[PDB]
Amino acid sequence: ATSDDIASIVNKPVTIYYSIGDGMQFSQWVGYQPMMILDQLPAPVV
Amino acid sequence: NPSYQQSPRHFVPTGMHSLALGTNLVEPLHALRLDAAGTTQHPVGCAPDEDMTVSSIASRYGLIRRVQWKKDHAKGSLLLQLDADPFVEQRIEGTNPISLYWFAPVGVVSSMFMQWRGSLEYRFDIIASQFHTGRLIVGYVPGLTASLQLQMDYMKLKSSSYVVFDLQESNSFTFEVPYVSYRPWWVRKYGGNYLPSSTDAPSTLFMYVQVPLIPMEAVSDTIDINVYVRGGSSFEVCVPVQPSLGLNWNTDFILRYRAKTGYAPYYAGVWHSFNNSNSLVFRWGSASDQIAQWPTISVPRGELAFLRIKDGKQAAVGTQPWRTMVVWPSGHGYNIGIPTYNAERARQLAQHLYGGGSLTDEKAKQLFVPANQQGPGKVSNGNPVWEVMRAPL
Amino acid sequence: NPSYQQSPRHFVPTGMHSLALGTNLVEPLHALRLDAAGTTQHPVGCAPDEDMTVSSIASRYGLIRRVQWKKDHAKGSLLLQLDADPFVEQRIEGTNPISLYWFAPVGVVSSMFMQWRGSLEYRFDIIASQFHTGRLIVGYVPGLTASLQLQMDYMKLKSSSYVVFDLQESNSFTFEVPYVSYRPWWVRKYGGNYLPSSTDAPSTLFMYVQVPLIPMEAVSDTIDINVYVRGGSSFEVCVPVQPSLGLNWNTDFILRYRAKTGYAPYYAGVWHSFNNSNSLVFRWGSASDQIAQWPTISVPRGELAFLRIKDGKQAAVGTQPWRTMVVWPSGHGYNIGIPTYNAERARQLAQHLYGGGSLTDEKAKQLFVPANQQGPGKVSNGNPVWEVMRAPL
Amino acid sequence: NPSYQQSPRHFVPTGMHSLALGTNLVEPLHALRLDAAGTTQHPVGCAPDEDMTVSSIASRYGLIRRVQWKKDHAKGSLLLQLDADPFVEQRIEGTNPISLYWFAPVGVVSSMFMQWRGSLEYRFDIIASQFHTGRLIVGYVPGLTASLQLQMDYMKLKSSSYVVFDLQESNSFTFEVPYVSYRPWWVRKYGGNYLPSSTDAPSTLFMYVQVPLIPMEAVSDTIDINVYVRGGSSFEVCVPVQPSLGLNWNTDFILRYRAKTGYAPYYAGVWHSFNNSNSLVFRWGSASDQIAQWPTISVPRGELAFLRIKDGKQAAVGTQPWRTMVVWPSGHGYNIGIPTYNAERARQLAQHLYGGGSLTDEKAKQLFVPANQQGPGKVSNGNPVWEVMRAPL
Amino acid sequence: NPSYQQSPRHFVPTGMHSLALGTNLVEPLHALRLDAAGTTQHPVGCAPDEDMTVSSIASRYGLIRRVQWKKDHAKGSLLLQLDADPFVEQRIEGTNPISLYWFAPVGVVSSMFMQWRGSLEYRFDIIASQFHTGRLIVGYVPGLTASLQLQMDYMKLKSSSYVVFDLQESNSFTFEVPYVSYRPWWVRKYGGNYLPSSTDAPSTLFMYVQVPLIPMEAVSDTIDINVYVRGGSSFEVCVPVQPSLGLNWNTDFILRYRAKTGYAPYYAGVWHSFNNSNSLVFRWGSASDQIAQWPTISVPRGELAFLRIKDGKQAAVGTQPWRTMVVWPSGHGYNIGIPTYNAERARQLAQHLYGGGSLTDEKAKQLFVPANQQGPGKVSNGNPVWEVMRAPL
Amino acid sequence: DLRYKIVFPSNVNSNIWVQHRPDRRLEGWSAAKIVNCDAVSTGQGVYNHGYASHIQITRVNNVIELEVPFYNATCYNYLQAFNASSAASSYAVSLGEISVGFQ
């Protein structure tokens, strides 16, 4: 785009998704780090 | 060149392929490679050794518990009670406002899935010499509610399935947990921050002291017991959902006055619909009517309000940082933000407007900042917070 | 899940299938049935007996002519002359402004097609006893123009092909008409109301009286002759066009001042671009600038014009039927219709405007109908006709 | 990499598949599963036992009638007359404004289909001892109109098909109903609330008393008779239409002044096209010209009208609930709603406007609510009803 | 004509084919030929002789170095040190601000690719008679950093791989370079002008003097040595990236006040939003609001600025070249350029505006150029540079 | 399984996501309806990660055609107007819970 058409593009969202493909190999077992529980997160109280 | 005169095809268009399916289809892509038949290789020593397999992850023991078993523990004292599920926790005593937890690998790989079933295997490694002598029950009661977690001893435990272990010369064993439920699978313990989806265990595991410890006078009087968890040979999980666990790489949570979302960063510029371009108003862009929009402050009769930015370093900048403003309806269906030179002017403009005045009044116009103060028209640092300054009117 | 990385297809889109082709294609549809393999059936007595076939329609005799053949008809008097085509007419003596016609089925099925060729078969049924004696020629002259339709007798007929029939005991015969032309097919007689497409017959059929009638004194002196037409065994038609015949189900034709087409029904409402919404103007809708548009009346210098609706019952209605108006440029590229209370006001407004005034003049504004007379804002009955009222100015 | 230079395909696009077809096609979808070849299973005890089959639903008896047959019923007294159709009703004596009905399963499964044909089976279970003795006709008259529903006895019944049943020791029988019509199928009794689609039965079933009841002095003098309906072995339905029956889960019907549909909820805000943003007007959104639109009240010359909300709790809220307003043309092709502080002001504004005034008059402007009363700009509760307040003017 | 009633296809659309893939697909095109099966030919003497092959390009020797080896060079003096990579440079001593370089063909064909590996072959041609006698090491040290490029002699060289060559009668040899790295490939030396992608050699080649030169008194005392490079039989490159080298066909580089990009060429015309079309303002087109936009000059309190074009021949032209202007906010979200008759007027207009004035002031209006000076309305020559004229105010 | 075809308005252009969450138990026949999400307190309003999702491009076509699979851990589910007695019976009314959101 040029300078005139780029004004309609400001603050517009772009999302990026990804899969893992194929021929995709993980090759060394490492245990998991400390996790965090999600429904223990605080709620946005009013 | 003959003419094809038969009837053509008659489809339905859609804009995207299967965003969820991943097994038995051939997904077409614009591969950013050079060869269309080219794939990735693994020659010959950089080959995969560990297959990505849930039955290979859940078959690995993870240390979840340590229990002190002492000499003065009486006959039948409780060592541990826990839940017959992969979701067994070990809390880290950290100073963060959100606490981290250790899990078994079966629990981490079961957090991603909604439903689980099968046997669990608890490995008890009792660190003792061949001169310590003791005896304990690892029992297992089918489904108990929260009010039945108490009223528990070693005698009610022996009504259900239980295993009594003697400690003479072999200091380790493995209790395989039965899977007893009214349901073939079992819905997981935590939800994806949806608190009305909490579900407790199918059943409860206990470990009491059947015969107390008799140590010799040359050895210690306390014994450590490690409890390891892995999902057994019949353990399996099915339905993928949002996982109830998160990483600790970015351990930062944000609890829920500023511009409406998207209308920042903003700068103080001019607008033909605000005093005929003669005065500064916050804009989120340079194009047609890209005017920043602002929330309505709740103001009761008998009060006023104006805004003072909490951190001036984050303010939009003209000939000065714009640290104070009044927010008022634009006449075009949203509120605009009108910077002032200082708090005194802002208070005087708010007095005028909440007092019944209009933006087109000469008294209001003289309190605006003139267009020639726009200067560089620098934008704010993101969407910074302003303090709502309230006063009686 | 492998990745498809080959090159895809490269079409051309069109929005509709073959609107004209109908034989050797498979037209895809959204069938409003339940079964995709389901079609319609005919079990077993509601089966088709008549195939839709042009050679089965044209093989059916249709009565086209009755001819009185009398005793006092002299030797060689003309009974009928007609055209060697399927387009032979029998006019009904009705009182309608458009006249209906009887046709043979070969003529009806040939009206739909552009070109025809082949033999025609004229069945002559001579209603007589076995005591009437006569003799007549059914002749056939190859191509004659309109100026050669006259200068015709029974003697010039015998130069061409002709058949002489005796009437003693067999009172019916069938003359098969030759097809003689410079052209393999033959373009039909009438067009689809395109008068420069008229074409006369390939040739002309006659029927004179070779020997006059000798009836006995106990029988009648007049004899009816029926003439039936069907397309023969070699008759055929090819190219489908717009058929030159219409049904008599709705025998109603419309011969070509009102609103421009589409800008009706209209009601008298208000518009920000006509006296700042203070006065009534005809609108064809309630949305942005849906203002009715009106033709320019041809008005010479020294005259005025205004409009008076022919039937007040068809008028738009506010606090009254709006039966009178003035039409004037809006300033926006079309003429608007401005209702008035009565003809006197309309004449006074037209005087002002055709006299050199403007819609923004106070004198004009005071002749408009005020907005508070909009009332229910009822629309006109369709697009009714107004009388153009003219006067010297 | 060769270049494909042949001619490509030439389709027609449509946006949706077969919304009605369901049998012999393969409908492509975006299945929200993980495996593309995966379907649903039934192992092995949760298998289907009842096939969804209309001939399996209509083969089930449903109790539709109870009939008291007494001792004092004379020879030939009518017990029941009903319609030879699956649409036989049993009304519940409820207090709802719309009445519920019991149907046979054949009637429920035939309500969904337009046309039915075949035999019906009426099971008569006569609850009696082996000491009651009686005899009755279950007759069947081919097609009767409404005026022939009367003039009926047991003697005209015996002209048509009929069955005489004796009651000595077997207390139950089954009458199979013939299907006699001029039409192979039969259009159902009720339409989808289209009252010009009503059609009565093909024929009429009766049940008279051939021999009256003789009970012994030790048993009762009244006998219950149950009448069960199921569609017989030849019953079938074909064309699916909108079903003429509804569930009783939500037994709530709504009989047909408020904002035009869609223009609610609304709040009182400002608009540059209404007194230059200085006064409150109802808006259905915060964006460009999202102004609520209101119906035109029918008002005769010599009257005024304004609006007063029926329930103030449902009103839009600024510094107060906006319970009163005047509706007037905006000048932009629709009516706007202008709140006032109270009914007195509304009456004074309506007086001004219906009296010939304009929204731009100072007298009108002073009766509007000023912009500084917008407050929180809370929306109405849905689209609430206002009372039309009328007065002489 | 049967009806196709099955379900149709269900695609995903994309607008362009594989822009990167080039080997194993069939790319469809609109070939601008006449025959769809026609390709290009090579009969029969205009056939290809050189296949486009990277192993055929890198197998060609390119002269990269000349080295003077003299008589007075002591035992162990360094002749050359260089990098064991295809990226070996020979700088041309030109007067251009950007310097050109000679490369081997292996280096040019390796500049286009990211990663290389394999053996290199350095051909040393020692131009001497059969009466010169000398001896030198061509050594090769595995990976050295920049701080280990020094501290190098002929004695540390003999710890690594090295080759000692005697010069008696054969005056040429070829040293094949080993490929020793921690990585199978090797990332190239230069990036596509991304300076944080620089990487030095895998290893370093040296050439010292093992035995100094003994020439006879009838021959010269200096000897030229040519160093040729080609990629050996095991050399190969894989991943294509942006090539780090450019041609010398257009050896012109542009180092980074004028109109914002795209808003030129411009001419001085009129605009309804600038003094009601009465004064000249720069426009980049003749259509709706095609007004040239200009950057904001950084101006501190106490100063002004205006513009004076550097080359008047490049100016827009009306009744004169428009060589001077003032830039000011338009009131529509961007700055406009307002030409003046001369610098004095521009300075007076800037004084007025930076002094607190407005474009709508009479004092400003009288300093604009009137519309009747538009003349031919000729556009500027491209987007020319203006000098920013600053003064105290 | 079930098959859902959702038709969106026309003049909108924005890209639409649809998730299926088979986690939401159905609590009573009340609030078994289309619910306008008005606030985000829990993880209900947010587009979550691991669920079966699909994004429809309104610029190409403003209708989505999807198949909701059977994911309950039961033999059957109830097929009447549901009356909530226990907590486990709430897991076995609907297949899941479809959330449609705009970007």
From TrEMBL, chains B, C, D, E:
<protein>
    <recommendedName>
        <fullName>Genome polyprotein</fullName>
    </recommendedName>
</protein>
TrEMBL record, chain F:
<protein>
    <recommendedName>
        <fullName>Genome polyprotein</fullName>
    </recommendedName>
</protein>
